[PDB]
């Protein structure tokens, strides 16, 4: 494959200045006979008070559903002993996985994650790599520290993850909002914004492009292509923060009958149905992907990875060395053991069960919106991916709109309070509104929304909450 | 009833002060409130977490076979953490909770044990102290710089110190002004004089690895800690005690091998009395932050430590943690909680006493070998009372090529390093650890070298082989 473009000009001055420890240049002499190596700081693994760790995990192909009790034939016991000799093959024995080591990641874990990445995403340049993270939260903080200096500008979705904005605000990085419709970023308006751009270009575009938080939108293949062309034309990176990528679902249909027939029935059909990632389009190497186990296995793993071109990933590693250092050896050893026990085939089985479970929740959620929410003042886009749904309301139709000084946010607050009074809580959309100006600034409404999740609660309680939300909209809008 | 700490919020960076809670925190109160269907969150379903159980085999108090004895037979205890609270022994963090998103402060069972531990050892002398989790001292140091420093601010560091700690400061544009040391650590009299003359904005804090100092192997005496605390109070800066080696304190070195066993701590009371007072034990004002870690006590791969300090300063670390590291591994915290609660405070003290015995013996063999093999004509050594590092100091001015080297001690250091490599032994040159920096604006404005070794990394037979090789290297270069 071709080499990626040289994008080291997009690194921050601070990232570029980062150095390896001066004790790197005695590492060669480590574990090399003839030399008694006394120049290091490693504690003795002999004292690590963990002889083995075990977990009980479910068994592919998860035929009883991924939520089935982990018992009987749906229970296998994985074991990571301290010594390599005591392990089945391809494990990270605790004497090494609980020892300081390469900030890039443990070799068995990285090998598995690299194969997964290439199998799904077919990275179309030669010099790509994967490094470990302790989750997309830390990966995001590190991304800002690698590509942004104080006063720099990034592009964000005009509604996005509040935590992502808070990280940007703490590093003094301007978050200029990119206009969305119910299907996400509008490529025409991003092209227009960049065609007129005054002063230093934004360093990158930050996108939760699958199951977007909070809109529940997913960028179509067609919008991803157009946004990619903009990033190549104006020379900025795309950061795809993709913890919800494997919460893609069957397309929603009003027709209940035509649902059981829709499910994917094998691995090659599953992999073909997945929306192309930005990394799959990234012939230039200007995409950095933040991947996580948090929504796939468990948030408490504190384990993810970063996909991108070797020379940009090398700067993240320098930062990792003097910040988070490395993920938990327990997390990385146990994830390695689970993924190798399942193998790629069982991990694919797991992702297919995840797809089936979320497809059903979304079906129940959207059936309930269609049923209970009054259509005269509302709309909804059924999500194709993610844990989130939204309800859009025409605030201008609230009977107190004039008394509220034509302020849509007073209508949002009144519907919020009414929802709580009816015994249901959604997240007001305005809470996710991104604000920012470039330095210097670029030359220079009535619809509100609420974010819900169908991932959290039992589906009987999801229907109870949404009927109550329907009542709250009816009471407030006088229908 | 202890005093309140001083209000030190004026020492926070403007950036830290401006950090906010998630707009979503003010709907958490409705979470799991009866009558509310809570659809406002983003927690995935614990029903799918593919871990029914995690277990570990750990050694058994009082570790009478030594902390490194095989974990088998009576020296094997199986701890289990089930997914469901009902399946666990008491005080466990069931995987349904430990593997779910949670308070960035920490899991309450782990915090409770580590707070008890902290008070039992350090007796924090103000009321409004707390502890929060970290993913180790590396991250807690990165966080400390982001909490108390803006670009162009100044911190005080030990003249020779941890290269990773300086790399972290350099990355944040924080100036590292070196504080003069002798073989016993920071010289308080010189630090007081530096501060008495100080022009421009005061340093935000002093960064010290005060016990088993990297790389000097020094430990500040109780007396130096007192004098240094007084300077921090008088000039109003914080003390960041980065203390991963606190529990590698050892018996005082004596040449008399016969005297060693009788002098050793055996009991919990003797142990708690032999430990050097922490800065937090002195910290009547609440101007100390302690970075604590299990990396040198349990295993580096836990990626679990904690931060000790006054409530209002730790809350700012928590805001930063929420949008950086988030939380330590729930496997790490759940297994650490299980191990610590199974051993209890009594078993944990037993472990720390075994650790003290193990390190004391490694240090005895290392220093006995230095005494035996390193030529005394051009060398000296300070036996450490704590840590994993020893040093050998050399008078570069006595090297026969000193004139040929233009009286550059660093050329004598390079020559000894190369000769050591050629004799088959490798130590870390002292100059590699030297800190440099100037305040903004700058303050108005040596023949000895040293090497750092560790006695913790290799079997003790190989350590003696290595230090005899280093003696040969010093004898060859100095012509002795
Ligand atoms: Cl796979
Ligand atoms: Cl809005
Ligand atoms: Cl000392
Ligand atoms: Cl020096």
TrEMBL record, chain A:
Ranges for domain Aminotransferase class I/classII large: 71-433
Subcellular location: Cytoplasm
Keywords linked to the UniProt accession: Aminotransferase, Cytoplasm, Pyridoxal phosphate, Transferase
Record's catalysed reaction(s): an aromatic L-alpha-amino acid + 2-oxoglutarate = an aromatic oxo-acid + L-glutamate
InterPro entries: Aminotransferase_I/II_large (IPR004839), Class-I_PLP-dep_aminotransf (IPR050859), PyrdxlP-dep_Trfase (IPR015424), PyrdxlP-dep_Trfase_major (IPR015421)
E.C. code: 2.6.1.57
Any matching Pfam family: Aminotran_1_2
Gene3D superfamilies: Type I PLP-dependent aspartate aminotransferase-like (Major domain)
GO cellular component: a single term: cytoplasm
Record field: transmembrane: none
Sites where the protein binds pyridoxal 5'-phosphate: 100, 136-137, 161, 213, 244, 292, 294, 302
GO biological process terms, semicolon-separated: aromatic amino acid family catabolic process; lysine biosynthetic process via aminoadipic acid; tyrosine biosynthetic process
Region listing for Disordered, in residue ranges: 1-16
Cofactor dependence: pyridoxal 5'-phosphate
Major subcellular location class: cytoplasm
Molecular function (Gene Ontology), one example: 2-aminoadipate transaminase activity
Family: Belongs to the class-I pyridoxal-phosphate-dependent aminotransferase family.
Protein name listed in UniProt: aromatic-amino-acid transaminase
């Amino acid at each position: 494959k071709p080499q990626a473009k040289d994008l080291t000009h997009l690194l921050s001055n601070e990232s570029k200045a980062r150095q390896t420890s001066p004790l790197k240049g005695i590492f060669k002499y480590y574990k090399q006979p003839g030399i008694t190596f006394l120049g290091g700081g490693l504690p003795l693994s002999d004292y690590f008070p963990f002889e083995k760790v075990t977990a009980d995990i479910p068994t592919p192909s998860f035929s009883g559903g991924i939520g089935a009790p982990i018992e009987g034939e749906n229970k296998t016991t994985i074991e990571v002993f301290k010594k390599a000799a005591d392990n089945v093959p391809d494990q990270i024995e605790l004497a090494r996985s609980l020892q300081y080591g390469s900030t890039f990641g443990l070799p068995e874990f990285l090998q598995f994650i690299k194969e997964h990445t290439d199998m799904v995403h077919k990275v179309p340049y030669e010099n790509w790599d994967v490094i470990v993270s302790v989750g997309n939260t830390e990966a995001w903080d590190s991304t800002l520290r690698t590509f942004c200096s104080k006063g720099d500008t990034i592009l964000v979705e005009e509604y996005t993850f509040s935590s992502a904005l808070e990280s940007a605000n703490g590093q003094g990085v301007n978050t200029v909002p990119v206009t969305m419709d119910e299907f996400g970023i509008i490529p025409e308006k991003l092209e227009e914004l960049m065609s007129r751009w005054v002063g230093n270009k934004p360093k990158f575009l930050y996108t939760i492009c699958t199951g977007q938080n909070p809109t529940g939108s997913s960028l179509s293949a067609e919008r991803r292509k157009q946004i990619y062309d903009i990033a190549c034309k104006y020379d900025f990176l795309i950061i795809e923060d993709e913890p919800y990528y494997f919460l893609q679902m069957e397309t929603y249909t009003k027709d209940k009958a035509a649902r059981e027939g829709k499910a994917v029935h094998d691995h090659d059909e599953f992999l073909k149905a997945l929306v192309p990632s930005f990394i799959s389009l990234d012939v230039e190497g200007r995409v950095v992907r933040l991947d996580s186990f948090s929504k796939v296995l468990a948030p408490g793993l504190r384990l993810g990875w970063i996909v991108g071109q070797k020379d940009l990933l090398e700067r993240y590693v320098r930062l990792h060395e003097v910040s988070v250092q490395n993920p938990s050896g327990f997390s990385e050893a146990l994830a390695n053991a689970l993924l190798r026990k399942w193998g790629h085939s069982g991990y694919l089985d797991w992702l297919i069960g995840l797809r089936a479970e979320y497809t059903h929740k979304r079906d129940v959620a959207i059936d309930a919106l269609d049923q209970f929410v009054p259509k005269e003042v509302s709309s909804f886009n059924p999500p194709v991916a993610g844990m989130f749904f939204t309800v859009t309301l025409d605030a201008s139709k609230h009977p107190k709109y004039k008394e509220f000084l034509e302020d849509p946010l007073k209508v949002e607050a009144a519907v919020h309070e009414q929802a709580i009074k009816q015994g249901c809580l959604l997240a007001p959309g305005s809470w996710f509104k991104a604000e920012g100006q470039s330095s210097p600034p670029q030359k220079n409404k009535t619809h509100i929304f609420f974010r819900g999740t169908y991932a959290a609660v039992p589906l009987d309680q999801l229907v109870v909450g949404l009927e109550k939300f329907g009542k709250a909209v009816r009471a407030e809008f006088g229908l």
